[PDB]
């Protein structure tokens, strides 16, 4: 009774076949890069409008890699977008060394992981590899973990 692993470790893709959720009814304002956190700025007709994470926002999900929706290499303004709201996913990071297992991550500007000492939110899942003179980490996203401030 076990969960299978997934083969290619590139940024922006899913790392396991555990319970995951993909919110595919969204549109982008500005440009978004695969493997970055996004935030919900508004809702029109059951569609969520997302943008790259600013300072002071609450992350909602992580952009997901697809080879039909995004032929350019990144997500462009006015495009339908895939966002992962629950599951394990490879994220871009600016950190230098792996944090403690099952710690709480903190997101800098642009939707990159820079902290490992948060109070509550998403947690580190134990994966830490290297990409392009930069690193990739593995994050565990949960649905109601970050709550929008009143």
């Amino acid at each position: 009774y076990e969960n299978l692993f997934l083969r290619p470790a590139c940024p922006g893709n899913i790392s396991d076949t555990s319970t995951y959720n993909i919110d595919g009814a969204c549109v982008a304002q500005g440009d978004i890069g695969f493997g970055s956190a996004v935030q919900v700025v508004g809702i029109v007709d059951g569609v969520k409008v997302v943008a790259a994470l600013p300072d002071g926002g609450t992350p909602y999900g992580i952009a997901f890699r697809s080879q039909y929706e995004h032929l350019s290499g990144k997500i462009l303004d006015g495009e339908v977008c895939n966002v992962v709201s629950h599951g394990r996913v490879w994220t871009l990071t600016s950190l230098g060394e792996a944090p403690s297992l099952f710690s709480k991550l903190q997101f800098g500007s642009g939707g990159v992981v820079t902290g490992g000492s948060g109070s509550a939110g998403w947690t580190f899942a134990g994966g830490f590899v290297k990409h392009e003179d930069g690193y990739i980490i593995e994050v565990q996203v949960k649905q109601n973990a970050f709550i929008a401030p009143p």
């Binding site: 959720n21 993909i22 919110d23 595919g24 009814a25 969204c26 007709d45 059951g46 569609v47 997901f64 697809s66 039909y68 929706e69 339908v80 977008c81 895939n82």
Partner: protein
């Protein structure tokens, strides 16, 4: 002229005391989605009745 300005029917047994008819309605919507999506919207149905004497 009441019986001639309005229709008259005979679909009622002499011994009946009441009758009933039914109405139906529906809801739903559609959305623009990408290829790897898991949040398709849903639909439903309705129903209501009335009586007479």
């Amino acid at each position: 002229s009441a019986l001639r300005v309005f229709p008259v029917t005979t679909e009622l047994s002499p011994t009946d005391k009441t009758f009933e008819y039914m109405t139906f309605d529906k809801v739903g919507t559609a959305q623009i989605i990408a290829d790897y999506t898991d949040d398709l919207p849903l639909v439903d149905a309705l129903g209501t009745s009335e009586f007479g004497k």
